[PDB]
Amino acid sequence: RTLIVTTILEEPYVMYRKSDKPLYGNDRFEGYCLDLLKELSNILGFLYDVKLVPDGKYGAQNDKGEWNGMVKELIDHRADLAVAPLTITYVREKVIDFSKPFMTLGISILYRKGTPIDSADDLAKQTKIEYGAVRDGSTMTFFKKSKISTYEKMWAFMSSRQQSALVKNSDEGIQRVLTTDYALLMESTSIEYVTQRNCNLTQIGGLIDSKGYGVGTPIGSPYRDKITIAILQLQEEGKLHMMKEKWWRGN
Ligand SMILES: Cc1cn(C[C@H](N)C(=O)O)c(=O)n(Cc2ccsc2C(=O)O)c1=O
């Protein structure tokens, strides 16, 4: 059985290789997730075929409860595994299974170095420094649905100063931090990627929430627990650390 692996283009997890050499099939791609999939394939002993998710979506449910993205590919048995920066969530576990996480992360703060700012609390209690998140993203949602005192205050601020505090996308938010007095609330993994490539930027404080990326499978898949096992082996043997360093480290 050659396993069909659904994934999504997302730097540095999955990218097309910068080459015009005759590369076909899986060889057309590179990235953290391709390296992970190669390790998993070697530990478990499976053949695989990477297919980009046709609709280019991660997987969310509509008003009717219909799914899309990588999640929908698993539900429909069009893919055996989803190997991507796909967050393990309560709603997704209702319809697919997941391995234990190969990466853990949490919302954090992206801002300039040299400022006395050291946490979310420092931001919340002031208005001189603008702060927000990508509009309608996972981070915005967290703040909007939160019942934690300080995050409700930060949300009230982000929403009332909506037109300006909430940006269109990560790229723009990064631009906003580099050119104005602004702090962007973003997923720690993305922040680490950006800070490695821009010495003027830094992460502020620790993690605000906590979640993990796991390999998705259809419910009942016999590969799920085997993938968890392989993930634990790779972590313990320092391989996930090396694979992260390979893709995240900058100049
Ligand atoms: C790599 C990656 C995947 N995803 C998709 C997410 N892990 C998911 O499984 O739906 C994501 O939402 N962010 C964070 C993100 C993207 C646009 S806004 C935003 C946020 O953190 O608000 C990411 O950085």
Ligand SMILES: [Cl-]
């Ligand atoms: Cl589990």
